[PDB]
Design an enzyme around this catalytic site. Sequence first.
Site, PDB file in Angstrom:
ATOM      1  N   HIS D  32       0.808  -1.215   0.000  1.00 55.69           N
ATOM      2  CA  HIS D  32       0.000   0.000   0.000  1.00 55.69           C
ATOM      3  C   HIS D  32       0.844   1.270   0.000  1.00 55.69           C
ATOM      4  O   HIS D  32       0.304   2.366  -0.031  1.00 55.69           O
ATOM      5  CB  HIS D  32      -1.029   0.008   1.135  1.00 55.69           C
ATOM      6  CG  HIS D  32      -0.445   0.215   2.493  1.00 55.69           C
ATOM      7  ND1 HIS D  32      -0.018  -0.830   3.286  1.00 55.69           N
ATOM      8  CD2 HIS D  32      -0.255   1.343   3.219  1.00 55.69           C
ATOM      9  CE1 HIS D  32       0.408  -0.355   4.442  1.00 55.69           C
ATOM     10  NE2 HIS D  32       0.274   0.959   4.426  1.00 55.69           N
ATOM     11  N   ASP D  78      -0.275  -7.832   1.647  1.00 54.77           N
ATOM     12  CA  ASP D  78       0.271  -6.480   1.653  1.00 54.77           C
ATOM     13  C   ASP D  78       1.783  -6.596   1.735  1.00 54.77           C
ATOM     14  O   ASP D  78       2.339  -6.497   2.823  1.00 54.77           O
ATOM     15  CB  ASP D  78      -0.225  -5.745   2.901  1.00 54.77           C
ATOM     16  CG  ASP D  78       0.050  -4.259   2.861  1.00 54.77           C
ATOM     17  OD1 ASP D  78       0.622  -3.771   1.861  1.00 54.77           O
ATOM     18  OD2 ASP D  78      -0.332  -3.571   3.833  1.00 54.77           O
ATOM     19  N   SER D 155       4.273   2.334   8.500  1.00 54.74           N
ATOM     20  CA  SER D 155       3.842   1.455   7.418  1.00 54.74           C
ATOM     21  C   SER D 155       5.022   0.847   6.695  1.00 54.74           C
ATOM     22  O   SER D 155       5.844   1.567   6.143  1.00 54.74           O
ATOM     23  CB  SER D 155       2.996   2.230   6.420  1.00 54.74           C
ATOM     24  OG  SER D 155       1.814   2.694   7.038  1.00 54.74           O
TER      25      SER D 155
END
Lengths: 109, 111, 202, 203, 232, 232
Positions: D32, D78, D155
């Site tokens: 992402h 992911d 992230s």
Amino acid sequence: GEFSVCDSVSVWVGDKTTATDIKGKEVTVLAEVNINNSVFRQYFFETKCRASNPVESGCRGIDSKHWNSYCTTTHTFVKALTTDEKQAAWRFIRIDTACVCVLSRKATR
Amino acid sequence: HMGEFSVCDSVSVWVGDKTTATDIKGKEVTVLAEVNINNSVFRQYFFETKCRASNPVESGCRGIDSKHWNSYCTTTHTFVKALTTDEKQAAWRFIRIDTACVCVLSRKATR
Amino acid sequence: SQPWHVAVYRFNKYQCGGVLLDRNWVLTAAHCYNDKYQVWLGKDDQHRLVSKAIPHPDFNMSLLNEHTPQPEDDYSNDLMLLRLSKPADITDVVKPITLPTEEPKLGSTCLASGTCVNLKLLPNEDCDKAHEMKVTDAMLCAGEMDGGSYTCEHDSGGPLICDGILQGITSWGPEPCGEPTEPSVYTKLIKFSSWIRETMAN
Amino acid sequence: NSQPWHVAVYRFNKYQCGGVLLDRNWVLTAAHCYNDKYQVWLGKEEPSDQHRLVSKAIPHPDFNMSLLPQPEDDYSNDLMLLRLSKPADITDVVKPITLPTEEPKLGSTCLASICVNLKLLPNEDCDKAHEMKVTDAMLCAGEMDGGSYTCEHDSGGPLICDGILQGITSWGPEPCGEPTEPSVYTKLIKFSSWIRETMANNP
Amino acid sequence: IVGGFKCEKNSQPWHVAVYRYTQYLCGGVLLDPNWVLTAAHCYDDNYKVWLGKNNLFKDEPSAQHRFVSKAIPHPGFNMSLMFLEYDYSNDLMLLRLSKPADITDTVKPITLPTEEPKLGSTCLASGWGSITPTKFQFTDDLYCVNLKLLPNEDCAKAHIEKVTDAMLCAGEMDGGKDTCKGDSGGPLICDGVLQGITSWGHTPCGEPDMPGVYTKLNKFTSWIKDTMAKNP
Amino acid sequence: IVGGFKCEKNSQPWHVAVYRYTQYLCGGVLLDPNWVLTAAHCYDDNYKVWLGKNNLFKDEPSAQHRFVSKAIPHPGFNMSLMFLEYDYSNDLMLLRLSKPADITDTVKPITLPTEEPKLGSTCLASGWGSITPTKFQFTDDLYCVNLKLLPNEDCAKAHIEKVTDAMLCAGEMDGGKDTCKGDSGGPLICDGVLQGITSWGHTPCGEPDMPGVYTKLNKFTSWIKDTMAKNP
Ligand SMILES: *[C@@H]1O[C@H](CO)[C@@H](O[C@@H]2O[C@H](CO)[C@@H](O)[C@H](O)[C@H]2NC(C)=O)[C@H](O)[C@H]1NC(C)=O
Ligand SMILES: *[C@H]1O[C@H](CO)[C@@H](O[C@@H]2O[C@H](CO)[C@@H](O)[C@H](O)[C@H]2NC(C)=O)[C@H](O)[C@H]1NC(C)=O
Ligand SMILES: *[C@@H]1O[C@H](CO)[C@@H](O)[C@H](O)[C@H]1NC(C)=O
Ligand SMILES: *[C@@H]1O[C@H](CO)[C@@H](O)[C@H](O)[C@H]1NC(C)=O
Ligand SMILES: [Zn+2]
Ligand SMILES: [Zn+2]
């Protein structure tokens, strides 16, 4: 004598209708709280910046030849009554709180 | 490491072991951990942000013209409505909470 | 555009505002009292040192400096005159203001200054209601209420110019600001005119 | 001396993600965090640091690119491998880190880079916080049982449990989530054969 | 130097211009062929020294130019400096040149003090600092100015910063004369004797009732003579 | 200039040093007896101009020093520059001298372009800037360095800041040579013909795969003669 690197303004806000939840979605604020009729109203203390370039170089007192600067508004999380479609509860909303100075290095030689 | 950064360093934490606070009226007050509103229990957590140091660098805040400006980082506060006890009553009063780390300037008298 | 506004740099404690009354005199509050002063006019603009500090004798000095704020404090007679060691130069930015002549109307639109300000002069009971301090007849009460955005400003010693004329001087109030709808208490200037005019002449 | 594998992926106009160095040539971040341009900053500019440009971006195919906020969103798979244009130099501040070997034990102590002591909780503790969809291909970690908690969310950052790399931070509200609500990391063993394959077929 | 006159062709040989590579940094006095004295707050990572100069942009063969191998600032200076009540007390720094100065007509050392200066004395201050009070317009020519040595109380009265027993208060009270930004490290020669080094003051410079503050060199004559022979 | 060699005495008579009173500001290039050209980001409030210099602390009689009476920066330069993706596009400025440069052997003007530079061209850049990559150590002597004119794509690749139409990319890709802080406003002469001015780059200087960005003068030759003819 003394003065801030970035100017700010502090106001109390009582006319807040919409806000941004901690999860990132929109939410609608509720004016009166606690019991059937306004035991206490929701007021939020906010602090925003006055300008991004108080001095056209950015923040005051920076070494303009070495650094690129700009003033940005920092946020905080406050618990408050709100609603999403029909479910209303206490949610953490993003509230403006300060005006800080950011820095990067100047490529100009 | 190679890009943008704060002029003054800070840290943001969620506080849940808070017992005392100095409210907006300047009075010392006791903060409770659990609220009781509309049949439910939610614990009182406050989002605080303080300075990491007064001198992230000896000369004061970062990127300041230390040969022209005197500088220091200081912690800024805000007011949040919280459940509190002021020995006799239990009421929702505005308490002083730490929120940012701003930089202050003065002019150097050194020539 | 408020030329009469002055800043009283008290050395190691909070700043105070004041009003310029005469090329030679400055009017601030008594609770602003300190041993060392520095008066900043304009806007290093102008800056002079203060030679003559004169609090109204009928003020309580015990109320001065770091008491735990209890609501039975009679800040009455909160007033002070400071004399400049050197006169202030009049410029398009530094100008005095005249003392009051007429009584204040309740309902008046007033201005106040400043971690502008459009107020309305309310009855003193509205102030007596927030058990924050003792409100007497030698005081005024003003608040603001046209919406849902009240600005956080409280200038100790600053002016309260009502219906275009000087009327009061900001007394004790919570800093930076009070509870969101709460009125502030200013010192009434008429009740003390005789005292001023004589200490300004004698 | 702490976490030398950590890297910052300067995604230009979008939010700065983190990552793990696995090889002198490979950096592993989250899918992402995908963008067109990338710049990878390794190290502690001021040389002790290192910055390389990326020559190849490779997300997992089995990811939903439409995700680039609702509780029925599957962030499953992911994962992304970024290949540097020039190799990273091994120094006393830049070191790679090995892929997992053994399975993660529930109840283990894990580290996480507007460095924290987490505990690997059962996936249910995540499911109950209706933020996103939690699947067997994800792990759940939560900072636990003190008085005050911290606010971090990197992230693509590493989740290192008991000395070994066990996960990579997936989606989550930023800067941080709620006061006791756990974060979801992408379980790595489950994708081990994919990484080794993409690494031996794209040099 | 605000409100002064240009110094005569080679009147101040003890005057030194301390540079930091290619940029001007401060002024200073020459004490010994190997030693130069300036102010602690001029502390940077390199010091070049231009000896015997009058106009920084002209050809002067009389001039010399040396490097510095060592720098020793007085331990009393709070180096966080280089709240409004600061204490710039022991503002002083010895600077050891590399190869010694060729003592000539245009490069002569000045003698340290063995005297407590008298009030009312007429003092001289020089330097390539600004001639304009507010804007900082440095000078090419070396300027001189005559100040009056006032009592330390005049300073403490007007400045919010600490005036201590290591400070000399000097200036004019009607205003118009004062040292200014860029004059630091320069001498305050009172009655022919070196008694001070320009340290701090007020900006705008040359304001009425606002004298400059100079480091009192005779309360330090010990640390200098010690540190000079030591070859630190 | 990092990774260069000391220039050859009269080699760069077009080279100028722009000072702001007493402090070094930027380098420059002389075009007309009463016109000097430097970079826009050197905008300050006073420009003194040293002409015909080789070493800033040495005695050079052949030199001259002129004051500047008028400054004209291109309107394209976002002067807010005196988020990381800045655009220093039209980095250019004309500086009209008060009294003209006395054209001699050590003070000679360089002619504006007609040509459009070719890649591979070896370009020269000179300047009193740093010889050290990280921290800044300016030079007294005027250094010269030979770089390669690279495609603008080599620059946009490595730099986070916009590389555009009005920019020339030059340097060496192995690393070791690149202009640096303080070299700005200087020339980039590609094969005898002046093609650019030194504008921005990356700190540390001379890093592999990080060329410098110079101002493409060819896209501005009409603005120069226009503003020269209008004797602003
Ligand atoms: C001049 O420069 C400023 C930056 O100092 C430009 O403003 C920025 O514009 C970018 C996009 O180009 C935004 O992302 C930044 O947020 C803006 N800066 C600030 C402080 O918010 C401005 O657009 C430039 N103007 C011109 C004509 O080039
Ligand atoms: C030298 O300067 C520092 C400031 O840079 C002094 O520190 C301050 O001192 C005053 C009291 O004298 C305090 O009120 C301030 O809060 C101090 N804090 C900071 C962060 O500046 C220091 O005291 C001075 N030197 C010595 C030796 O004490
Ligand atoms: C003065 O103020 C103090 C504190 O409020 C109070 O205790 C005292 O009674 C006051 N003085 C008089 C004479 O009332
Ligand atoms: C991708 O996301 C959308 C919205 O979350 C979802 O409806 C769709 O099924 C997803 N695609 C796949 C292949 O599952
Ligand atoms: Zn002043
Ligand atoms: Zn680099």
